[PDB]
Design a protein around this ligand. Sequence first.
Ligand SMILES: CCCCCCCCCCC(CCCCCCCCCC)(CO[C@H]1O[C@@H](CO)[C@H](O[C@@H]2O[C@@H](CO)[C@H](O)[C@@H](O)[C@@H]2O)[C@@H](O)[C@@H]1O)CO[C@H]1O[C@@H](CO)[C@H](O[C@@H]2O[C@@H](CO)[C@H](O)[C@@H](O)[C@@H]2O)[C@@H](O)[C@H]1O
Ligand SMILES: CC(C)CCC[C@@H](C)[C@H]1CC[C@H]2[C@@H]3CC=C4C[C@@H](OC(=O)CCC(=O)O)CC[C@]4(C)[C@H]3CC[C@]12C
Ligand SMILES: CC(C)CCC[C@@H](C)[C@H]1CC[C@H]2[C@@H]3CC=C4C[C@@H](OC(=O)CCC(=O)O)CC[C@]4(C)[C@H]3CC[C@]12C
Ligand SMILES: CC(C)CCC[C@@H](C)[C@H]1CC[C@H]2[C@@H]3CC=C4C[C@@H](OC(=O)CCC(=O)O)CC[C@]4(C)[C@H]3CC[C@]12C
Ligand SMILES: *SC[C@@H]1NC(=O)c2csc(n2)[C@H](C)NC(=O)c2csc(n2)[C@H](C)NC(=O)c2csc1n2
Ligand SMILES: Nc1ncnc2c1ncn2[C@@H]1O[C@H](COP(=O)(O)OP(=O)(O)OP(=O)(O)O)[C@@H](O)[C@H]1O
Ligand SMILES: Nc1ncnc2c1ncn2[C@@H]1O[C@H](COP(=O)(O)OP(=O)(O)OP(=O)(O)O)[C@@H](O)[C@H]1O
Ligand SMILES: [Mg+2]
Ligand SMILES: [Mg+2]
Length: 1177
Amino acid sequence: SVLTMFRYAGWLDRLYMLVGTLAAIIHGVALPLMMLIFGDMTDSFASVGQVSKQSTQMSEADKRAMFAKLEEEMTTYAYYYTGIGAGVLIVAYIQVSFWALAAGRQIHKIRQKFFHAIMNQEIGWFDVHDVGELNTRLTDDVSKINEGIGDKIGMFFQAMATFFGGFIIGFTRGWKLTLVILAISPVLGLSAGIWAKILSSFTDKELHAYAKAGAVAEEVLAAIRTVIAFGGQKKELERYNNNLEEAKRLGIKKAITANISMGAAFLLIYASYALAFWYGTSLVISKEYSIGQVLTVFFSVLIGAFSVGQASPNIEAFANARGAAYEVFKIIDNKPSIDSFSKSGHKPDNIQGNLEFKNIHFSYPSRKEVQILKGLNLKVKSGQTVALVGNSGGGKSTTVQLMQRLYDPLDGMVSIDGQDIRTINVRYLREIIGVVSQEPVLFATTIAENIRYGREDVTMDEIEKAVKEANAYDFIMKLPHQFDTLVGERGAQLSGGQKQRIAIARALVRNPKILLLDEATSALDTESEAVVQAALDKAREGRTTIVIAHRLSTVRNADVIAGFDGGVIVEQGNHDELMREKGIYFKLVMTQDVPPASFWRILKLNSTEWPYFVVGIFAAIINGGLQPAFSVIFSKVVGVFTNGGPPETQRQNSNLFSLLFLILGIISFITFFLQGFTFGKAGEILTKRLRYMVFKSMLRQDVSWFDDPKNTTGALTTRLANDAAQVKGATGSRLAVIFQNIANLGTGIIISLIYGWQLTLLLLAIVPIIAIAGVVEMKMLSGQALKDKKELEGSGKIATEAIENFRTVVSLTREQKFETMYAQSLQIPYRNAMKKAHVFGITFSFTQAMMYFSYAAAFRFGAYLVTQQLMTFENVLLVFSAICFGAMAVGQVSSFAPDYAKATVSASHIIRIIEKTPEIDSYSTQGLKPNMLEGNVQFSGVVFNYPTRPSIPVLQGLSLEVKKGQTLALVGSSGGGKSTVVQLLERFYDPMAGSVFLDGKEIKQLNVQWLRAQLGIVSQEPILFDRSIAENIAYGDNSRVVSYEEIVRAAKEANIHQFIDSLPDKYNTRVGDKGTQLSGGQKQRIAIARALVRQPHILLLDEATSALDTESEKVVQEALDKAREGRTVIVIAHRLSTIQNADLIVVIQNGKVKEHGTHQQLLAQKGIYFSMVSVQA
Ligand SMILES: CCCCCCCCCCC(CCCCCCCCCC)(CO[C@H]1O[C@@H](CO)[C@H](O[C@@H]2O[C@@H](CO)[C@H](O)[C@@H](O)[C@@H]2O)[C@@H](O)[C@@H]1O)CO[C@H]1O[C@@H](CO)[C@H](O[C@@H]2O[C@@H](CO)[C@H](O)[C@@H](O)[C@@H]2O)[C@@H](O)[C@H]1O
Ligand SMILES: CC(C)CCC[C@@H](C)[C@H]1CC[C@H]2[C@@H]3CC=C4C[C@@H](OC(=O)CCC(=O)O)CC[C@]4(C)[C@H]3CC[C@]12C
Ligand SMILES: CC(C)CCC[C@@H](C)[C@H]1CC[C@H]2[C@@H]3CC=C4C[C@@H](OC(=O)CCC(=O)O)CC[C@]4(C)[C@H]3CC[C@]12C
Ligand SMILES: CC(C)CCC[C@@H](C)[C@H]1CC[C@H]2[C@@H]3CC=C4C[C@@H](OC(=O)CCC(=O)O)CC[C@]4(C)[C@H]3CC[C@]12C
Ligand SMILES: *SC[C@@H]1NC(=O)c2csc(n2)[C@H](C)NC(=O)c2csc(n2)[C@H](C)NC(=O)c2csc1n2
Ligand SMILES: Nc1ncnc2c1ncn2[C@@H]1O[C@H](COP(=O)(O)OP(=O)(O)OP(=O)(O)O)[C@@H](O)[C@H]1O
Ligand SMILES: Nc1ncnc2c1ncn2[C@@H]1O[C@H](COP(=O)(O)OP(=O)(O)OP(=O)(O)O)[C@@H](O)[C@H]1O
Ligand SMILES: [Mg+2]
Ligand SMILES: [Mg+2]
C-alpha cells in the first residue's frame, strides 16, 4: 500500500506538486551548473599572476593591468551569482510554497475522509475495535503524514536534482570517473531504502503504542468520577505508563535506525571521494585524462554527493509519514455491510407500522458463541403498544437494537408492513424510528441543541411543545438562559431524571411512527412518570410503540404483552389472558505572556540524562566544524594534486588523501550517529516524562476542573497529545542540528579570521540579516500557534463526542451533522496552514537568496581587496566557502525557529498544567487518618452551589444525621439534590456554608484518599471500564491485590455470579466501553459488586436498583440486610418497599430537609411522603 498517501490529490493539488518538483529540479541543478561555469576553463583561475613567481615576471606595470583583468572577471562572476541568486529566490519559494500548500490540502481532505470513515462504520465494528484510539489517530498520525508530504519532498527532489545533474555533467566531462562514482551510488540507494523500510515499520508500531496510550487516557478521563471515587489514579497512571514505555522504546529504535542511515550515507559520500581521487590519479599518470578533466569531475560530482547526504532526513520524514498512513487508510477502505450513508434502498411513502420478527436468531459480534435470541417471533400491528417483559439479559434491548438495525440477525427476518428492513434505506429506516435508551446519553452542548439532534429542522414552538410533553418545561424555565443551558459530557451536569426527560423530548421532536422506549422512566419520579405516560397515551394512536419498563401500570396499560424466556417469547396476549395463563408475567406481577524561557524550563526537566547532552554536543561540534574544515582540506588536496612537480610515484603516494578521506568518513559516521542518537534518546525520554507528568497532573485535578466546558475529554486528550508532540518536535534530533550549525558558523568565522581578514566583517554582516528574517517569521507563527491549538482542541472534542456516543449518533442519524461540525472546527487550521506555508516558503527563499547574494558580495569585496593587494588571492576561496557555510547554518537555524515558536506555547501549557494545584488535593498525604471510625455521618446546614451554575442554589442548608447500623432513605423529586449529597460526601466539591462530619470530624480536616477509601458508592449511572469483569470488580478496592475468591463472593452477593459463570472466559470476559457490552441489569449488578467488594463502612446507593428484576432486587436486598448492622447505609430510590424498610427517611424539597422520621411516623402525619405512599397504594 504505497502512494495511497496521495489518494486525495486533485488537479490543482497535482499541479502544485508538479510545479514544485520542477522548481526543486531547477534549484538543485543550479549548483552543479554554477560549478561547471567555473569549470568552463581548465584551472578555474583566470591568471596565476603574482602568486606564481616561477618565471622572473619583472613587470611592475603589466601586473597591475592583469590584476584589473582579474577584477573584471570577478565582477562578471559576481553579476552572474546575483542573477543565480534571484533565480534561486524565485524557485525556492515556488517549490516550498507549492509543496506545503499541496500537503495542507491533502491533510485537510485526509482528516475529513478519515472522520467520515469512522462515522460510516457499524455498531459491531465499534464493538470489536478499541475506538478510543481513533481520536488519537486523528490528532497524531495525520500530523505525522503532514511532515512527510510537505516541504521535505521538495528538499529531497532538490538534492536529487543536485546529485544527478552533477553526475550528468560528470558523464559529459569524465564519463569513466563519473561511472566509477555512480557505481558506489547504488550502495547509498540500497541503504536508504532498507533503513526507510525499517523506519516505517518502527513508526507504525510506535504510533500503535501511542494510540493505545491515548485510548487508555480517553477511557480514564471519560470516567474520571469513578476513578476519583475509587482512588484508581495510580493504576490508570501505570496503564498509561506501560504504553509510554513501549512508545519510548520504539522511538529510541527509530532514532537509532535514522542515525545509522544518515551516518552510513555520509561515510559512503566520503568513500566516493576517496575512490574518485584514487581513480583520477590512476588515470592521470596513465595519461588517459588531463588534470582539468578530473578536477571538473570532482567539482561536479562530490558536491551533489554531499547534497544527498544532507537530504537523507527528508527520506526519514517520508518514511515516518508512510508508517503513519497505514491504519488511517486501512479504516478508510473498510466497507460496512450496513451503510448509513448509502442512497440505495426503499423509502415507503406511507408506513402504518407492522413490526414482524420471524424466527430471529441473533448473537453479538463481540461475543458470538453466546446465543441471545433463538427463534424470536413477534407481530405488532399498526398503532398498538406491546410490553416486553422478562429477566435481565433476556434480549429486550437486543430486540430494540435489532428494530433500528444496529446489527443484522444471523437468522430470521425483521420486517415493517411486510417489507424486510434490509431492503429499506438505512437512514430512512432510522429516521422513522424514535428511541429512548435504557440510560440516555446527551452531548456537551445546550439543551436546545441536544433536542435538535433528534430533528434538525425543528421550530422553537414545537420544541417547547415536546418539552411540555416530556414534563421538562419547569426545570428548564427555572434554569437561567433557558434552553441555552450547557450540560456536561453525556449530560453529566443534569440530574438523571432531567437527562432522561431531555432524551424523551429529543425522541418526541422526531415525530416517530415507530417509538422505542427501553426503560424511559427509570430515573423519573411518580408525578413525572404519570404525566409522561398520559402525554404518550394522548398521541398513541398515530404511531406504533414498543416499551420495556419495570412499573406494572404501564405494562398493564399496553395493548399486548410479550414475555421473554431463553431467547424466545413464551407468553403473548392481553393482560387478562396472561394473568389467567399463570406464566412468567404472573409471577412477575405477584412478586411485589507565553514566555520564551519555558523552553529552557522544560529542558531543565531533561537534566537527568545530561551525559547524552554533552556527548551529542561534542559530536555536533565535531561535524559542524569538520564541514568548513573539509572545505579547506579539499582545497589543499586539490592544490597538492595539481602541483605534481615530482612526476608519478610521489602522486601514487598521494593515495594518503584517500586514507584521510576514509578516516574522515569513519569519523563522520561515528559522530553523526552519536550526536543524533544521543539527542533522540534524550528527547524521547523527555517526551515520555512530559506525557506521564501531564497525565498525572490531569488525574490530580478536581471534579470542578473536569466540569469546565473547555476541559472536555476529547479536548483533554487532544491537548495532551498535541502539546507533547510539539515539544518533541522541538526536542528531538533537531536541536542537534542547531548545535551543529552554531559550531559550523564558529569554525567558519575562525578559518576566515585565520586565512584572511576584513572579509569576516561581511560574515558579521550576514548573520543579522538572515536571522532577522526567521525572527519575524517566528513571531508571526507564534501569533497563530496558540489559535491552532485551541481549534484543534475543539475539533478533538467533536470527534470524541462522536466516538464515545457513536450508538446515539447512529440512532439519531446525526453522523452528517457531526461531520459538518468537524469540518467547521477544522476550517481555521486550514487557513492557518495555508498562511504558514506561504510565510515559511518566503523565509526559505529569502535565506537561500541572501546566501547567494552575500556570496556575490564576497566576490566583489575580495576582488577589491586583491586589487588593493591588502589580502592575497589564494585564500579568498576558503573565506568564501566559510561565508557560504555560515550562511547555510544561519538559514537552517532560522528554518528551525518556526518549530521553536510552535513548541514554546506547548511547553508553557505543560508547565502550567504541571504546577497547577487543585483545591481538594487527592495526591496529598497531609490530613487526618483516624485509627478506627464509627461511621456517623452528619450534614450540618450544608449549602452548596455547583461551580458551573454558581447562581442556582442546590442545597439550602439541610440537616442530616445517620448512625452506624442505620439505613437512611433520601426521597424527593427530580433535581432536589439527592445525588448532590452523595457527591458532597465523596468530597467532589467543597460546600461554602455548612459542614459534613464523619464521627464528629469535618471532612476537610481528613485525608481525602483515606476518606474516599472509607466509602463505597453506587452511582445513578454506573460506569464500567473496557476490561474484564474480574478486573472491573477488583477495581472497587484498589491499593490491595483483590483475590479471586472474594471477587466471586462479591459477585454472588450481587446476584451476578451465575451470568458470569454461564459466559465463556468466565470472569475474564471483556466488557465494552462504559459497560455497553452488558445488559443494564448486569452492568448495575457488577457495579454493586464492585462497591461491595470494598466492604465499606459507609455504603452509598444512588438508584442502585434502577434496572433490576424482582429476583435480583430481592437477592440484593437480602444480601444488604445480612450486613445492615456494622455499617452505615444511605439509599436513594423511588421504590416504596425499599424506602419503607429503611430505618429512617428524609424528604428533600428543592434542597431543604422537610420531613424526617420512620415510615410509620411519616405515614401517620399528612405530608408529601404520605401523599406519595397513598398515590402508590
Ligand atoms: C518572513 C516574513 C515575510 C512576510 C510574511 C507574510 C508574507 C505574505 C505574502 C504571501 C502572499 C503573496 C506571496 C508572493 C511572494 C512572491 C515571491 C516571494 C519572494 C520572497 C523573497 C500569498 O499569495 C497570495 O496571492 C494571491 C494572488 O496574488 C492569491 O489569491 C488567490 O489566488 C488563487 C489561488 O487559488 C485563487 O484565485 C484565489 O484563492 C485567490 O485569488 C493567493 O495565492 C494568495 O492569497 C500574499 O499574502 C497576503 O497578501 C495580502 C495582500 O496585501 C493579503 O492581505 C489581505 O488581502 C485581502 C484578501 O481578502 C483582505 O481582504 C485584506 O484584509 C488584506 O489586505 C492577504 O490575503 C494575503 O494574501
Ligand atoms: C521518496 C520521497 C521523499 C518522494 C516520493 C515521490 C512522491 C512524492 C511522488 C512520486 C510519484 C507521485 C505520484 C504519481 C501518481 C499519483 C497517483 C494519483 O492517484 C491515483 O491516480 C490513484 C488512484 C486513486 O485515485 O485513488 C495521485 C497522485 C500520485 C500519488 C502522485 C503523488 C506524488 C508522488 C507519490
Ligand atoms: C544516492 C542517490 C542515488 C539518491 C539515493 C536515493 C535514491 C536511490 C531513491 C531511488 C529509489 C528511492 C526509494 C523508492 C521507494 C521507497 C519506499 C518508500 O516506502 C517505504 O519506506 C517502504 C516501507 C515498507 O514497505 O514497509 C519510502 C521511500 C523509498 C525508500 C525511496 C527512497 C529514495 C530512493 C532510494
Ligand atoms: C543510476 C544510479 C543512481 C543507480 C541506479 C539504480 C538504483 C537507483 C537502484 C538499484 C537497486 C535499487 C534498490 C533495490 C531494492 C530496494 C528495496 C526497497 O525496499 C522496500 O521498499 C521493500 C518494501 C516491501 O518489501 O514491502 C527499497 C528501495 C531499494 C533499496 C532500491 C533503491 C534504489 C536502487 C539502489
Ligand atoms: S558553500 C556550500 C556549497 N559548497 C560545498 O558544499 C562544498 C564542499 S567542498 C567544496 N565546496 C570545495 C572547497 N569547493 C571548491 O573548491 C570550489 C571551487 S569553485 C567554487 N567552490 C564555487 C565558487 N562554489 C560555489 O559557487 C558554491 C555555492 S554553494 C556551495 N558552493
Ligand atoms: N453490545 C453487546 N455486545 C455483547 N453482548 C451484549 C451486548 N449488549 C448486550 N449484550 C449481552 O446480551 C445479553 C442480552 O442483554 P440485553 O441488553 O439484550 O437485555 P435486556 O432484556 O435489555 O435487559 P435489561 O432488562 O437488564 O435491560 C446479555 O447477556 C448482555 O450482557
Ligand atoms: N455537575 C453538575 N453541574 C451543575 N449542576 C448540576 C450538576 N449535577 C447536577 N446538577 C443540578 O443540580 C440539581 C440536583 O442534581 P442532583 O443530581 O443532585 O439531583 P437528584 O435529586 O439526585 O436527582 P434525580 O432524582 O433526577 O437523580 C439539578 O438542578 C441538576 O441539574
Ligand atoms: Mg436492556
Ligand atoms: Mg440523582
